[PDB]
Design a protein around this ligand. Structure first.
Ligand SMILES: O=P(O)(O)O[C@H]1[C@H](OP(=O)(O)O)[C@@H](OP(=O)(O)O)[C@H](OP(=O)(O)O)[C@@H](OP(=O)(O)O)[C@H]1OP(=O)(O)O
Lengths: 222, 222
């Protein structure tokens, strides 16, 4: 992370060992589950690219997922090296502008990452861009390791409607389908895959029942 | 039918044999079913009374129904001979105005029917008036031969709600009851005679559910 010091300059404070150990624990227990994507973001907040590399280096043993996060990073960096091209011959005595690889931290020092992150002129938020690239990689890992598909989720005959709602929305988090497909699933598939009685109360509510109206109506049905 | 020819005058083109044979087929297969009433209208469009008589003469063997269509025609002609009385002594060299019997074509030539149908002054649409009289006769035949009464129609335990709706409305077409009785049947009897589950979803919808709302709610119930 970065702390400001007297003179208006900034320095690097290494991520706490227990901040790194929390990340490890999460990846070892949730197995790249939907929750890992937000868990990574909260534990990587205010981090330079250098620190994000260490967090990944602490969870490298999960090689399959790391290979997926690594192929997504290279592509989001290539797109940065195509749409943010070298401006031209950089003047001497000046830091080069960041390339996709600098945003990652692989070809750049943490100080360079800090100089960009806090440029008085055109600050480049290299830490947040790289966290966004890794979140695309982790979300692809959440989908690949997702244990139950949205379609398979079906309310148990006795299962309370809210727990069936809880499992239905958790699988939808993994789904990478178009947002309209997500809206049609929450409005059509969720009434389609409910136990016989809850299905009669939901159809009873009428057309386009909101989730609050559906949860309120099926509370204690079954 | 009637075609216009050079000089501004009109002539008669005999109904096609296959237009007449379609009519026969329909009456022989639908057995004066609700569908016969519209089927007659489409196959009698732009016909003089003379042609409508031939269509009836092609389906005379159905004597019982023909006797009903014939008693309705005589009464709709008597009402025309009472409310459209002979104006008075007709001038010589002029076509007499049409009487109920002329509208039928029984006491009138097709040319007279055409002269009225296309009078430059007060054209009388004898072909359409007679088609309307026969439709009253066929509709009475649809009701007399109707196999299932609106009340008897009751959704099967597994029957999809739409098929029960299809049979319920087909019997209502035969019903000659006041329109309010028709509106109360479609809004009350249709929910009353549905299988136990669909009846619970329809009551669930609330008061005065539209048919679209009822079909949408019971789709896939049972
Ligand atoms: O009504 P018909 O006396 O039996 O004649 C019909 C009629 O032709 P006309 O319009 O000249 O009367 C058909 O037209 P429609 O009345 O059905 O619209 C036409 O068929 P098209 O729709 O293609 O015009 C068909 O001609 P064909 O079946 O040879 O294609 C022809 O029937 P016939 O000549 O066989 O008697």
């Amino acid at each position: 992370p970065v702390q400001q010091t007297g003179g208006g300059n900034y320095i690097h404070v290494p991520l706490s060992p227990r901040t790194l150990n929390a990340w490890v624990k999460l990846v070892e227990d949730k197995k790249f589950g939907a929750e890992v994507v937000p868990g990574f973001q909260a534990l990587s907040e205010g981090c330079t690219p250098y620190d994000i590399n260490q967090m990944l280096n602490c969870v490298g043993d999960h090689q399959a997922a790391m290979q997926i996060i690594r192929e997504i990073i290279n592509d989001e960096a290539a797109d940065w090296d195509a749409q943010h091209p070298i401006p031209g011959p950089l003047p001497a005595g000046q830091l080069r502008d960041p390339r996709g690889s600098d945003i990652a931290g692989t070809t750049s020092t943490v100080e360079e990452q800090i100089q960009w992150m806090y440029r008085p002129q055109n600050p480049v938020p290299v830490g947040n861009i790289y966290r966004r690239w890794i979140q695309i990689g982790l979300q692809k890992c959440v989908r690949m390791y997702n244990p139950t598909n949205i379609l398979d989720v079906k309310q148990g005959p006795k299962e309370p409607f809210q727990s069936y709602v809880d499992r239905f929305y958790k699988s939808l988090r993994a789904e990478q389908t178009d947002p309209a497909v997500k809206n049609w699933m929450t409005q059509t598939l969720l009434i389609q895959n409910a136990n016989p009685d809850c299905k009669l109360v939901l159809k009873g509510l009428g057309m386009n029942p909101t989730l609050e109206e559906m949860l309120t109506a099926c509370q204690g049905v079954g």
